[PDB]
Design a protein around this ligand. Structure first.
Ligand SMILES: *[C@@H]1O[C@H](CO)[C@@H](O[C@@H]2O[C@H](CO)[C@@H](O)[C@H](O)[C@H]2NC(C)=O)[C@H](O)[C@H]1NC(C)=O
Ligand SMILES: *[C@@H]1O[C@H](CO)[C@@H](O[C@@H]2O[C@H](CO)[C@@H](O)[C@H](O)[C@H]2NC(C)=O)[C@H](O)[C@H]1NC(C)=O
Ligand SMILES: *[C@@H]1O[C@H](CO)[C@@H](O)[C@H](O)[C@H]1NC(C)=O
Ligand SMILES: *[C@@H]1O[C@H](CO)[C@@H](O)[C@H](O)[C@H]1NC(C)=O
Ligand SMILES: *[C@@H]1O[C@H](CO)[C@@H](O)[C@H](O)[C@H]1NC(C)=O
Ligand SMILES: *[C@@H]1O[C@H](CO)[C@@H](O)[C@H](O)[C@H]1NC(C)=O
Ligand SMILES: *[C@@H]1O[C@H](CO)[C@@H](O)[C@H](O)[C@H]1NC(C)=O
Ligand SMILES: *[C@@H]1O[C@H](CO)[C@@H](O)[C@H](O)[C@H]1NC(C)=O
Ligand SMILES: *[C@@H]1O[C@H](CO)[C@@H](O)[C@H](O)[C@H]1NC(C)=O
Lengths: 131, 430, 186
């Protein structure tokens, strides 16, 4: 009548009155990430590995702006992933950051290569070098 | 030696480690008020565990930032430089070691080598993200990561993705092959290889006459290192070892929630539904003690293990500084044998170094002299090589390639008084 | 960190550890010794566990300061008293020298480096092939054209100098991609 795993958990079930096989899964009991800046008043919320629909329909219901990111669902922050910041104090992961000016979800690029306007070919056997 | 070749050797050095976060209350208790009221007596273990975990996770990010800064210390590239048609210089093919795909030169930094290396292990940061995204939805089998994430144990991604370290390694590799060559003291790659080979005791004539052969040997060694991964190589084993150890540790920590520890049951629901309140508070105490002991043991093990990967990352930084960007007079440091140069690439939780070495294949027996004494009772000693006698005339030869050369002032050391066991040759004037 | 660790170790004496009172003098008249032994056992076990955890943490932390002191000794040996041919070891950049001073629970190193401020673009050549089909290569620098003459310049400062025998390296056979200048007799 039951189906167990190789550890001692419960995955299966069989109703003896209807002859139907069911499965068992635990519902969400995760955690929330909160980014806060001492100059602001509100918070920047992040539900990791969750679609915004699952949060708005099952977890809770808020009246704040929200969007979907690579890490999860972000609340109280706009989508500005095309702007890079060198120095960040709110690191979220996977090269993302939260800036305050009002929270903005931006990228993290701390190091960049210095570019020079010189050629790469050799004309007459000579190269262009800055001394 | 009378004939030589170039060989390649790979090495993997671990830099980062998966970041594990545990929820004390959700691990010891679960949605139960009596368990929390009884745990409130031990009001110091959870905060200390959280503080130790945060201190552990901070240093990994700091070390990753240090490595990222070290990889791009003095890299200076050119603006008019694209990788879609510029991938070979001086008969050296390096297309399989550069990224920068597309017009924007971004969002795809891993090359063919890094792709082949990453396609072996799936439990990377992107792997953990894709695994955790599959816990809400689907009627497939229940993965262990999802049942671990619902109890408090969760793996968080690092602050810098692998696609950024790949773009740094790509720039570091490109900076050594196009002007300005700010990775080889400002000389081309072929001339740098020639000078490194000549510094071992090889003449310049054989290097100038056999440049294409050296390039072909370098390409063959690179291809061998590339296609030598579909085997039992130790690099892939070292890469899989950390993931396997982390998985085993997480499983052993999760299995601690199904032990009675001297109580009557491993579930608080069975205890709070069959025993009276004033007596049921005895088994919960034993369960809490056992779970706190397990958590303390895991925290101690993690804190003891972190220092190893920290020192490994320090050694990797030193290797990048003293083997890739420059060559230091240190024997058997970068690689075993006559070291020429080394290249660096990214790898799951660390770096992969490819060292190129000079290996002879055929030898010839000769007679040599450590020094000579000439007319003015003046001693002459070889710089790097030996003195031979060919066609009844003293000449000089190298220590790594048999090529006789006439004795000149550019390969000898003078001494105002020669030793007592020097060959007497009072017919050589300089 | 030391202050926080000491405070956390001190706060362990105010916990009950499942007993009826956190203090030891409190339960000496309101409870019998046969019933107070079990209460004292819990406190003893908790305090011993806390002490063992603190000892383990200290023993784990000592190795870090040991490695740091070893690195400081190596730095003093190879950066202050002398300069070893190692790149990006003492500092980050063109290292010149370093000085050492005493610091609370450690040492402070002051490294001095050479930093350019203005650049000039020029045309350089990695080597030359001269009259006797012989190759000449710069030791540390480049070969440039100045006043229609082949001169030598440094890699860190622009100063044209005449080509001599103390700043070049000779080779009996020049490479295939060396600049041909059959007028520079040396
Ligand atoms: C968040 O912002 C990013 C960047 O502005 C959006 O990504 C762009 O989406 C448009 C429309 O799909 C594409 O045409 C662009 O090519 C995308 N750019 C990049 C860099 O990916 C993204 O769609 C926005 N919304 C979300 C939910 O991420
Ligand atoms: C000498 O210079 C020539 C000209 O740049 C090189 O010839 C080129 O070599 C690259 C790399 O193999 C090829 O992609 C080009 O197609 C070649 N161009 C021509 C016109 O042949 C040559 O390889 C250089 N030789 C050395 C030893 O550096
Ligand atoms: C379920 O299956 C058993 C055996 O095939 C049968 O005896 C029983 O009547 C079934 N029950 C229903 C509700 O169909
Ligand atoms: C808010 O930002 C301003 C400008 O950066 C700064 O002067 C001020 O100290 C900040 N306030 C707090 C509470 O940090
Ligand atoms: C979440 O809410 C949706 C919409 O009300 C519903 O269809 C779904 O069954 C809910 N899921 C859970 C786990 O409650
Ligand atoms: C490069 O990084 C530095 C410091 O991190 C920053 O000041 C600069 O603006 C960056 N440049 C670019 C083009 O991102
Ligand atoms: C780069 O240099 C070329 C020639 O000197 C010039 O035509 C071009 O405008 C320069 N570009 C920039 C961005 O300075
Ligand atoms: C050195 O070995 C290679 C490969 O065996 C061969 O092609 C070449 O001719 C050899 N050189 C000499 C001088 O024997
Ligand atoms: C997640 O589920 C989807 C269902 O289509 C599947 O295609 C994908 O491979 C799964 N990912 C992982 C990491 O299991």
């Amino acid at each position: 009548n039951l189906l167990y795993d190789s550890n001692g958990n419960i995955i299966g079930f069989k109703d003896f009155v209807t002859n139907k096989t069911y499965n068992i899964f635990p519902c969400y009991a995760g955690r929330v990430s909160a980014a806060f800046h001492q100059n602001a008043s509100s918070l920047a919320l992040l539900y990791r590995n969750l679609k915004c629909s699952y949060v708005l329909n099952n977890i809770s219901l808020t009246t704040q702006p929200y969007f979907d990111s690579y890490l999860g669902c972000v609340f109280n922050a706009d989508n500005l992933t095309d702007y890079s910041v060198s120095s960040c104090a709110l690191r979220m992961g996977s090269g993302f950051c939260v800036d305050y000016n009002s929270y903005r979800f931006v990228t993290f690029e701390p190091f960049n290569v210095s570019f020079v306007n010189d050629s790469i070919e050799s004309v007459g056997g000579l190269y262009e070098i800055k001394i | 030696p009378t004939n030589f070749t170039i060989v390649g050797q790979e090495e993997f050095i671990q830099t980062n480690s998966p970041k594990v976060t545990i929820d004390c209350s959700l691990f010891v208790c679960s949605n139960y008020a009596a368990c929390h009221d009884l745990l409130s007596e031990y009001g110091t273990f959870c905060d200390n565990i959280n503080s130790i975990l945060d201190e552990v996770n901070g240093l990994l990010d700091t070390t990753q930032l240090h490595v990222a800064d070290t990889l791009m210390q003095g890299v200076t590239l050119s603006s008019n430089l694209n990788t879609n048609l510029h991938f070979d210089v001086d008969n050296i093919n390096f297309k399989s070691l550069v990224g920068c795909l597309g017009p924007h030169c971004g969002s795809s930094s891993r090359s063919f080598f890094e792709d082949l290396l990453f396609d072996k292990v799936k439990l990377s940061d992107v792997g953990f993200v894709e695994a955790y995204n599959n816990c809400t939805g689907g009627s497939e089998i229940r993965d262990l990561l999802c049942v671990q994430s619902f109890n408090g144990i969760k793996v968080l991604p690092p602050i810098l993705s692998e696609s950024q370290i790949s773009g740094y390694t790509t720039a570091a590799t490109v900076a050594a092959m196009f002007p300005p060559w700010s990775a080889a003291a400002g000389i081309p790659f072929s001339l740098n290889v020639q000078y490194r080979i000549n510094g071992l005791g090889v003449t310049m004539d054989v290097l100038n006459k056999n440049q294409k052969l050296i390039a072909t040997a370098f390409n063959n060694a690179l291809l061998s290192i590339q296609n030598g991964f579909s085997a039992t190589n130790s690099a892939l084993a070292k890469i899989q070892s950390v993931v396997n150890s982390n998985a085993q540790a997480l499983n052993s920590l999760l299995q601690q929630l199904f032990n009675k520890f001297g109580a009557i049951s491993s579930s608080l629901q069975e205890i709070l539904s069959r025993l009276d309140p004033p007596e049921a508070q005895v088994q919960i105490d034993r369960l809490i003690n056992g779970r706190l002991t397990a958590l303390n043991a895991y925290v101690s093990q993690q804190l003891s293990d972190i220092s190893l990967v920290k020192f490994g990352a320090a050694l990797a930084m030193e290797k990048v500084n003293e083997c890739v960007k420059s060559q230091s007079p240190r024997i058997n440091f970068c690689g075993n044998g006559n070291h020429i140069l080394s290249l660096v690439q990214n790898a799951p939780y660390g770096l992969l170094f490819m060292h190129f070495s000079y290996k002879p294949i055929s030898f010839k027996t000769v007679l040599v002299s450590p020094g000579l004494c000439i007319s003015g009772d003046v001693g002459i000693a070889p710089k790097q090589g030996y003195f031979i006698k060919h066609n009844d005339h003293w000449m000089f030869t190298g220590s790594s390639y048999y090529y006789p050369e006439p004795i000149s002032d550019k390969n000898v050391v003078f001494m105002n008084t020669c030793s007592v066991n020097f060959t007497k040759a009072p017919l050589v004037y300089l």
